[PDB]
Enzyme design. Sequence first.
Site, PDB file in Angstrom:
ATOM      1  N   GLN A  78       0.808  -1.214   0.000  1.00  0.00           N
ATOM      2  CA  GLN A  78       0.000   0.000   0.000  1.00  0.00           C
ATOM      3  C   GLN A  78       0.842   1.265   0.000  1.00  0.00           C
ATOM      4  O   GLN A  78       1.916   1.320   0.599  1.00  0.00           O
ATOM      5  CB  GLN A  78      -0.934  -0.001   1.202  1.00  0.00           C
ATOM      6  CG  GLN A  78      -1.974   1.093   1.159  1.00  0.00           C
ATOM      7  CD  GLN A  78      -3.164   0.803   2.047  1.00  0.00           C
ATOM      8  OE1 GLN A  78      -3.152  -0.118   2.886  1.00  0.00           O
ATOM      9  NE2 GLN A  78      -4.203   1.608   1.884  1.00  0.00           N
ATOM     10  N   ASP A  83      -7.001   2.856   0.516  1.00  0.00           N
ATOM     11  CA  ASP A  83      -7.661   1.789  -0.240  1.00  0.00           C
ATOM     12  C   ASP A  83      -7.225   0.385   0.178  1.00  0.00           C
ATOM     13  O   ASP A  83      -7.156  -0.542  -0.639  1.00  0.00           O
ATOM     14  CB  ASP A  83      -7.505   2.010  -1.750  1.00  0.00           C
ATOM     15  CG  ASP A  83      -6.070   1.847  -2.250  1.00  0.00           C
ATOM     16  OD1 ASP A  83      -5.107   2.013  -1.472  1.00  0.00           O
ATOM     17  OD2 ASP A  83      -5.910   1.564  -3.454  1.00  0.00           O
ATOM     18  N   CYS A  84      -6.962   0.205   1.477  1.00  0.00           N
ATOM     19  CA  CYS A  84      -6.619  -1.120   1.985  1.00  0.00           C
ATOM     20  C   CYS A  84      -7.618  -2.204   1.584  1.00  0.00           C
ATOM     21  O   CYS A  84      -7.207  -3.329   1.274  1.00  0.00           O
ATOM     22  CB  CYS A  84      -6.441  -1.066   3.506  1.00  0.00           C
ATOM     23  SG  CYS A  84      -7.895  -0.548   4.471  1.00  0.00           S
ATOM     24  N   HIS A 241      -9.050  -2.115   9.399  1.00  0.00           N
ATOM     25  CA  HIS A 241      -8.054  -2.324   8.356  1.00  0.00           C
ATOM     26  C   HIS A 241      -8.281  -3.675   7.693  1.00  0.00           C
ATOM     27  O   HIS A 241      -8.359  -4.701   8.374  1.00  0.00           O
ATOM     28  CB  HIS A 241      -6.641  -2.258   8.951  1.00  0.00           C
ATOM     29  CG  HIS A 241      -5.545  -2.289   7.929  1.00  0.00           C
ATOM     30  ND1 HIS A 241      -5.397  -1.318   6.962  1.00  0.00           N
ATOM     31  CD2 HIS A 241      -4.511  -3.146   7.762  1.00  0.00           C
ATOM     32  CE1 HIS A 241      -4.343  -1.599   6.215  1.00  0.00           C
ATOM     33  NE2 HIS A 241      -3.782  -2.700   6.684  1.00  0.00           N
ATOM     34  N   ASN A 265      -1.308  -8.387   5.799  1.00  0.00           N
ATOM     35  CA  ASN A 265      -1.547  -6.959   5.893  1.00  0.00           C
ATOM     36  C   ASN A 265      -1.168  -6.304   4.550  1.00  0.00           C
ATOM     37  O   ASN A 265      -0.010  -6.407   4.152  1.00  0.00           O
ATOM     38  CB  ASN A 265      -0.698  -6.410   7.039  1.00  0.00           C
ATOM     39  CG  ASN A 265      -0.809  -4.905   7.219  1.00  0.00           C
ATOM     40  OD1 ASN A 265      -1.391  -4.188   6.400  1.00  0.00           O
ATOM     41  ND2 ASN A 265      -0.238  -4.416   8.322  1.00  0.00           N
ATOM     42  N   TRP A 267      -0.361  -3.459   3.835  1.00  0.00           N
ATOM     43  CA  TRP A 267       0.812  -2.599   3.959  1.00  0.00           C
ATOM     44  C   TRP A 267       2.064  -3.310   3.462  1.00  0.00           C
ATOM     45  O   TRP A 267       3.024  -2.658   3.041  1.00  0.00           O
ATOM     46  CB  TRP A 267       1.046  -2.174   5.408  1.00  0.00           C
ATOM     47  CG  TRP A 267       0.065  -1.210   5.956  1.00  0.00           C
ATOM     48  CD1 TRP A 267      -0.901  -0.538   5.270  1.00  0.00           C
ATOM     49  CD2 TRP A 267      -0.056  -0.809   7.318  1.00  0.00           C
ATOM     50  NE1 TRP A 267      -1.619   0.249   6.124  1.00  0.00           N
ATOM     51  CE2 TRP A 267      -1.113   0.112   7.390  1.00  0.00           C
ATOM     52  CE3 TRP A 267       0.642  -1.132   8.490  1.00  0.00           C
ATOM     53  CZ2 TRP A 267      -1.501   0.709   8.593  1.00  0.00           C
ATOM     54  CZ3 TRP A 267       0.261  -0.536   9.673  1.00  0.00           C
ATOM     55  CH2 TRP A 267      -0.798   0.365   9.721  1.00  0.00           C
ATOM     56  N   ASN A 285       8.312 -26.363  18.103  1.00  0.00           N
ATOM     57  CA  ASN A 285       7.649 -27.619  18.447  1.00  0.00           C
ATOM     58  C   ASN A 285       6.779 -28.144  17.315  1.00  0.00           C
ATOM     59  O   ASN A 285       5.829 -28.903  17.541  1.00  0.00           O
ATOM     60  CB  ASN A 285       6.833 -27.446  19.718  1.00  0.00           C
ATOM     61  CG  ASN A 285       7.713 -27.270  20.915  1.00  0.00           C
ATOM     62  OD1 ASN A 285       7.694 -26.224  21.558  1.00  0.00           O
ATOM     63  ND2 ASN A 285       8.496 -28.294  21.226  1.00  0.00           N
ATOM     64  N   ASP A 287       6.799 -30.010  13.399  1.00  0.00           N
ATOM     65  CA  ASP A 287       7.529 -30.860  12.473  1.00  0.00           C
ATOM     66  C   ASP A 287       8.452 -30.022  11.574  1.00  0.00           C
ATOM     67  O   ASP A 287       8.024 -28.988  11.053  1.00  0.00           O
ATOM     68  CB  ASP A 287       6.487 -31.629  11.657  1.00  0.00           C
ATOM     69  CG  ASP A 287       7.085 -32.435  10.567  1.00  0.00           C
ATOM     70  OD1 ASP A 287       7.507 -31.850   9.554  1.00  0.00           O
ATOM     71  OD2 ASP A 287       7.147 -33.663  10.748  1.00  0.00           O
ATOM     72  N   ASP A 292       9.296 -25.787   7.600  1.00  0.00           N
ATOM     73  CA  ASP A 292       9.876 -25.284   6.358  1.00  0.00           C
ATOM     74  C   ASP A 292       8.814 -24.918   5.328  1.00  0.00           C
ATOM     75  O   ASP A 292       9.019 -24.001   4.524  1.00  0.00           O
ATOM     76  CB  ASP A 292      10.838 -26.314   5.774  1.00  0.00           C
ATOM     77  CG  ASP A 292      11.754 -25.717   4.716  1.00  0.00           C
ATOM     78  OD1 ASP A 292      12.783 -25.096   5.069  1.00  0.00           O
ATOM     79  OD2 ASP A 292      11.423 -25.889   3.521  1.00  0.00           O
TER      80      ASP A 292
HETATM   81  C1  LIG Z   1      -7.416   0.927   5.473  1.00  0.00           C
HETATM   82  O1  LIG Z   1      -7.127   0.477   6.779  1.00  0.00           O
HETATM   83  C2  LIG Z   1      -6.227   1.664   4.809  1.00  0.00           C
HETATM   84  O2  LIG Z   1      -6.297   2.012   3.670  1.00  0.00           O
HETATM   85  N1  LIG Z   1      -5.049   1.974   5.635  1.00  0.00           N
HETATM   86  C3  LIG Z   1      -3.891   2.683   5.052  1.00  0.00           C
HETATM   87  C4  LIG Z   1      -4.090   4.199   4.960  1.00  0.00           C
HETATM   88  C5  LIG Z   1      -3.142   3.608   6.022  1.00  0.00           C
HETATM   89  C6  LIG Z   1      -8.558   1.921   5.526  1.00  0.00           C
HETATM   90  C7  LIG Z   1      -8.224   3.125   6.417  1.00  0.00           C
HETATM   91  C8  LIG Z   1      -9.410   4.193   6.482  1.00  0.00           C
HETATM   92  C9  LIG Z   1      -9.434   4.819   5.196  1.00  0.00           C
HETATM   93  C10 LIG Z   1     -10.083   6.119   5.173  1.00  0.00           C
HETATM   94  C11 LIG Z   1      -9.397   7.126   6.024  1.00  0.00           C
HETATM   95  N2  LIG Z   1      -9.161   6.682   7.471  1.00  0.00           N
HETATM   96  C12 LIG Z   1      -9.164   5.176   7.720  1.00  0.00           C
HETATM   97  O3  LIG Z   1      -8.994   4.768   8.810  1.00  0.00           O
HETATM   98  N3  LIG Z   1      -9.640   1.228   6.173  1.00  0.00           N
HETATM   99  C13 LIG Z   1     -10.868   1.084   5.432  1.00  0.00           C
HETATM  100  O4  LIG Z   1     -10.952   1.548   4.316  1.00  0.00           O
HETATM  101  C14 LIG Z   1     -11.996   0.323   6.120  1.00  0.00           C
HETATM  102  C15 LIG Z   1     -11.863  -1.140   5.658  1.00  0.00           C
HETATM  103  C16 LIG Z   1     -13.135  -1.980   6.008  1.00  0.00           C
HETATM  104  C17 LIG Z   1     -12.975  -3.389   5.386  1.00  0.00           C
HETATM  105  C18 LIG Z   1     -14.018  -4.419   5.858  1.00  0.00           C
HETATM  106  C19 LIG Z   1     -14.581  -4.139   7.256  1.00  0.00           C
HETATM  107  C20 LIG Z   1     -13.608  -3.340   8.134  1.00  0.00           C
HETATM  108  C21 LIG Z   1     -13.346  -1.954   7.537  1.00  0.00           C
HETATM  109  N4  LIG Z   1     -13.192   0.890   5.576  1.00  0.00           N
HETATM  110  C22 LIG Z   1     -13.560   2.253   5.889  1.00  0.00           C
HETATM  111  O5  LIG Z   1     -12.902   2.946   6.625  1.00  0.00           O
HETATM  112  C23 LIG Z   1     -14.851   2.708   5.184  1.00  0.00           C
HETATM  113  C24 LIG Z   1     -15.661   1.828   4.469  1.00  0.00           C
HETATM  114  C25 LIG Z   1     -16.757   2.590   3.924  1.00  0.00           C
HETATM  115  C26 LIG Z   1     -17.899   2.292   3.135  1.00  0.00           C
HETATM  116  C27 LIG Z   1     -18.785   3.324   2.783  1.00  0.00           C
HETATM  117  C28 LIG Z   1     -18.534   4.635   3.219  1.00  0.00           C
HETATM  118  C29 LIG Z   1     -17.413   4.929   4.000  1.00  0.00           C
HETATM  119  C30 LIG Z   1     -16.514   3.889   4.356  1.00  0.00           C
HETATM  120  O6  LIG Z   1     -15.360   3.940   5.112  1.00  0.00           O
END
Ligand SMILES: *[C@@](O)(C(=O)NC1CC1)[C@H](C[C@@H]1CCCNC1=O)NC(=O)[C@H](CC1CCCCC1)NC(=O)c1cc2ccccc2o1
Length: 327
Positions: A78, A83-84, A241, A265, A267, A285, A287, A292
């Site tokens: 990332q 966009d994780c 995340h 992750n 990242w 502990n 095998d 491996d």
């Molecule tokens: C990821 O963790 C990520 O991209 N992290 C890298 C930047 C460091 C994001 C972070 C999120 C992104 C927006 C800004 N601040 C943040 O914390 N996490 C998400 O996108 C999160 C993932 C979902 C996946 C499945 C369930 C757990 C959470 N989604 C949101 O934050 C999100 C989803 C969504 C849908 C509709 C409208 C808003 C919205 O936000």
Amino acid sequence: ENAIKYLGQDYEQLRVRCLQSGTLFRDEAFPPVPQSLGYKDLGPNSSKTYGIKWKRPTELLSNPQFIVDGATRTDICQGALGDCWLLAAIASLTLNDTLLHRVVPHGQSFQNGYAGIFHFQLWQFGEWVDVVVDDLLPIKDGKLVFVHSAEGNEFWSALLEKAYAKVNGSYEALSGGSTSEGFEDFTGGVTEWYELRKAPSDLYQIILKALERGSLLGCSIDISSVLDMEAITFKKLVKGHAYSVTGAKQVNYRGQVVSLIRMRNPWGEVEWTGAWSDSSSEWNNVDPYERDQLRVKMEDGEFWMSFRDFMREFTRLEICNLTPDAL
Ligand SMILES: *[C@@](O)(C(=O)NC1CC1)[C@H](C[C@@H]1CCCNC1=O)NC(=O)[C@H](CC1CCCCC1)NC(=O)c1cc2ccccc2o1
Ligand SMILES: [Ca+2]
Ligand SMILES: [Ca+2]
């Protein structure tokens, strides 16, 4: 069976035209302009866009490659964008060889036949579509700003991320999202959601079968509030995340059969430090062959957990099956 051309753009036609014309493709549909980056956080006058320029890989290195040692989950590291969920979907996708080869048309290169244009297939509103991009990518300080491969001269995942931004209208539009959307847009499947606290007693077997079929799986930890979004726990899990679930296996351990689950992750770094972590003593502990086979000592974002710890630390699982009613 054959993909529809997104916005009417014909990859082969445009490539041949540019090639005969001695020019490089420039995408009228998604040009290298501030609007393509974003509108508010990534907007024209945001400090987040400081120093960002647009360059093709051929304007960056000597020998840029589309795919190097295969298109695999380690190519998904990332960048500076939220966009994780999408990158976890790509990493999971790499484990389904057929779908991976549909979304990512292999054999595109920066060498023979290169005219500065690439294409990808995406499942959109019930049909497969072919999306073209030019290979201009956002760069700061000579490096890719957004997704990148651990291999610095590999560009397929950067270009796929760009194509997904294109259909969404900008990179910023991808910040904050749901993993299920990426899973489905890469497969044409449908996702089922599991609340871990209320899962069926055979969830581990469901996970094993799903991974075996080539379904896409992800998992996450709930946030308590807005300010523990992306909080890093003491044992270096990340809340709010998207993680790819990339494997599962049972091993013999201390006289019992212990079920392990492997996750990544997006990242490409920061991992679990508990039992079954890369350097943990549990592997002593196990095998030596299984050790491996499963254990890789590498800061790569991918790690194992016992299914017990998984159920203790994570909150949600997603499984995106292609044909859930016809196994
Ligand atoms: C990821 O963790 C990520 O991209 N992290 C890298 C930047 C460091 C994001 C972070 C999120 C992104 C927006 C800004 N601040 C943040 O914390 N996490 C998400 O996108 C999160 C993932 C979902 C996946 C499945 C369930 C757990 C959470 N989604 C949101 O934050 C999100 C989803 C969504 C849908 C509709 C409208 C808003 C919205 O936000
Ligand atoms: Ca690779
Ligand atoms: Ca690791």
